[PDB]
Amino acid sequence: SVELRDATVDDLSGIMEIYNDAVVNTTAIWNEVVVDLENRKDWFAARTSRGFPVIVAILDGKVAGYASYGDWRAFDGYRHTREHSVYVHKDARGHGIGKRLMQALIDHAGGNDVHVLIAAIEAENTASIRLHESLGFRVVGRFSEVGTKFGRWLDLTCMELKL
Amino acid sequence: SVELRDATVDDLSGIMEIYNDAVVNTTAIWNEVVVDLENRKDWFAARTSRGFPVIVAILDGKVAGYASYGDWRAFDGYRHTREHSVYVHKDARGHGIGKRLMQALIDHAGGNDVHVLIAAIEAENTASIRLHESLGFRVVGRFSEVGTKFGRWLDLTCMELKL
Numbered sequence: 001s002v003e004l005r006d007a008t009v010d011d012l013s014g015i016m017e018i019y020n021d022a023v024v025n026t027t028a029i030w031n032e033v034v035v036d037l038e039n040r041k042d043w044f045a046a047r048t049s050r051g052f053p054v055i056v057a058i059l060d061g062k063v064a065g066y067a068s069y070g071d072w073r074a075f076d077g078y079r080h081t082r083e084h085s086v087y088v089h090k091d092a093r094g095h096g097i098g099k100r101l102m103q104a105l106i107d108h109a110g111g112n113d114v115h116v117l118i119a120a121i122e123a124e125n126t127a128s129i130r131l132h133e134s135l136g137f138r139v140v141g142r143f144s145e146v147g148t149k150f151g152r153w154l155d156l157t158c159m160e161l162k163l
Numbered sequence: 164s165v166e167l168r169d170a171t172v173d174d175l176s177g178i179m180e181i182y183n184d185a186v187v188n189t190t191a192i193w194n195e196v197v198v199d200l201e202n203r204k205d206w207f208a209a210r211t212s213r214g215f216p217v218i219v220a221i222l223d224g225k226v227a228g229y230a231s232y233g234d235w236r237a238f239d240g241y242r243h244t245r246e247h248s249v250y251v252h253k254d255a256r257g258h259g260i261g262k263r264l265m266q267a268l269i270d271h272a273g274g275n276d277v278h279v280l281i282a283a284i285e286a287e288n289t290a291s292i293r294l295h296e297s298l299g300f301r302v303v304g305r306f307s308e309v310g311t312k313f314g315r316w317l318d319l320t321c322m323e324l325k326l
Binding site for chain 1 (some may be wrong): 192193195196204210235236238239241242243244278279281283297302303304306307308310311312313316317319323325
């Protein structure tokens, strides 16, 4: 049984764990520096201030996933465009948590004057691309070797969903 | 004749004028925020610190255009990817200033450990698209209605140049 709800500062340690795991063992985050609670508290506050959602998926009283969206491009002209992110705990995959989280964001976006959702996915992450496509996202394009991690060049596949 | 060189604080008011003009009558900048001298000063100080170039084209003793690049995506993993912008003064068009400014940016980037240059062009700006193509940029994709200005939705065509 999984329940999604708005996150609170109390959920930050569980969100941090998921975040730091992606930083170390995935290409979902293009950064190699783990953050501390204070860093996630600032991140959480920044989202709250802008009215951006932060949703957690609760499994066994623990945070098994989280999702949020925010600026895609920092310009007033993009007011109606937001870039979303969805993360599922390494030990909670295969339960459909990912799709429920993304759907939760789509629903919030649609009611938050959001016209377009943008996804920045590591090009080789087939699971993520298929998840987005299953939700109506369309492939915009693939940027070649724009990122680097694990000592290798990474491509960025962007997708869009008009609301 | 036109000549290109590094911008100094003394070129900031001229740069400001070109920037503000773009904000007022074009889709080159997605917002309606007119900037003052202090803004350009901070902007100029931040780029100088990051080692990002600020090149101006001088014609008839005045700034006939300027160019620069900075972060594309504010993340450590994108350290070798930069987004550039080139602006030609409205009264100095048709002098090949645009191409020369972009070439200068490409040259600087090639010696600044930049692997990819990214162009974010308003979709209908065919002239800009062609200018980038003449310099080797290739289309990645086009985002639909991700921006708004002048009361209408704008599309964003992104292009890339691998160095």
